[model samples]
Target: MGLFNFVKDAGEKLWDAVTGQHDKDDQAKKVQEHLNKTGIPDADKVNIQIADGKATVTGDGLSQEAKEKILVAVGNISGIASVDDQVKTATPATASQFYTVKSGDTLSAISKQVYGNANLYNKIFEANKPMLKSPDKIYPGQVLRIPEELEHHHHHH
Candidate 1:
């Protein structure tokens, strides 16, 4: 029975290591929010557990798809090492793109010309409206945040 108990206890410990992510404090929450806002949601699913000087994370995600993304996010944060991700890819969303507005250029004309959808011109308008201060006013040197859908540039190519 001694050997059996030892084996049982070992199994239990392993289970906790693989499944437990303790809330040491609000640090995890803060980390989660930071990851989400930084345009990296894959890191948000992480669970952090700490013991001694070691931090461990256990969860499921796409086959290492977000591994690099998550690492880049948490590598800067303290306490990271024993991380397991079982995350699976449902579908990867395209990242947003940006562009600058030139003088004598109209939002409608730019969108129609760039996106090939004339009615989609409002896309450029809405994206830049916050900085433009007016619908019809835009300076030649001003930079604009172009929505991913409004522009058709592929990064993976």
Candidate 2:
């Protein structure tokens, strides 16, 4: 789960609505405003990049279910497009710790060991997008940005 591709493009025209300054923290603030006022949605991370009449919001939650709730809250807001929330289901791990590629290790295994789910290996792949050209290209000694779970990991009911 990542972005609303169409809305992401719209952001090109509505940058201020999406992000006042493109600062990570500021982008997160707009999302927070939308959340607290929109309803009961909570996001660990909320990104807004808008230009023209479109805006793209990307976010993460502690739990997969919370992601859904957040999406409904934000997507259905009177002004935003109702893109299906692209929230992901992987728990976040610290970025500083580096794992040496071992004989039997896979990204899936590491994702599971650290976050309790293996299918989310893409989270690791995504975290290191700058260094990771593809999910299949990790090596033994690459140091990458470890994305933490959104500030608040939701405990979905």
Candidate 3:
């Protein structure tokens, strides 16, 4: 239900080649297919519209996890500058935090900074699955989800 910013030049090249007139429908279809391939639950049910580097998503009956994942999946594509999330979840859930990668950053390092415990790095890694093949493969400007539950554990201990 809000706008999420992303690194426009730092994502998968999912747009059409630079040329003459662009087809909005074609671009949307490519983004839709890419979303389905990300393995998000019921991803096919989500709808996307793209224009001028902004992606607007609309869907219903999604889990909070699915909604967040869909937003990240769509926003992380090349040429996409921001995402306008208009999806609804069947049940309310705490929204996860989003972090953009920077040079020389690792999951362990990020975990230490966010949770004050490096060992919990895998939590971040697991939260961004399929999109993140290896913890060692993350690059600068890429965004990853930090599940809200991770912070709860830190505070309880």
Error in Å for residue 61 of model 3: 0.8
Q: lDDT (CA) for every model shown? A: 0.41, 0.43, 0.74
Tens-place lDDT digits, model 3, residues 1-157: 4888887665667764342127776767777888767675656767887775787887889788888888777777777777888888897776788888788999887777666766767877787775666677777767877777534544523
Using lDDT as the yardstick, the better of models 1 and 2 is 2
Better of 1 and 3 by lDDT: 3
Residue pairs in candidate 3 whose N, alpha carbon or C atoms collide under 3 angstroms: none
> Please, what is the TM-score per model?
0.33, 0.32, 0.86
List the candidate numbers ranked by TM-score, top first.
3, 1, 2
Q: Model 3: which ten-residue window has the lowest total lDDT?
A: 12-21
lDDT of 1 by residue, 44-81 (tens): 55554333213344445532434434433332233332
Report the lDDT tens digits of candidate 2 across residue range 1-157.
4433222211112125433456544444554565554344345455444332234555654454445434433333223343444445466424222333334566776666555666656766665443344555644333222334444355211
- For each candidate, how many residue pairs have backbone atoms clashing (under 3 Å)? 7, 14, 0
By lDDT: ranked, best first: 3, 2, 1
- Candidate 2 wrong stretches, greater than 4 Å: 1-31, 51-54, 91-157
Model 2 Cα RMSD, 1 decimal: 14.3
Residue 29 lDDT in model 2?
50
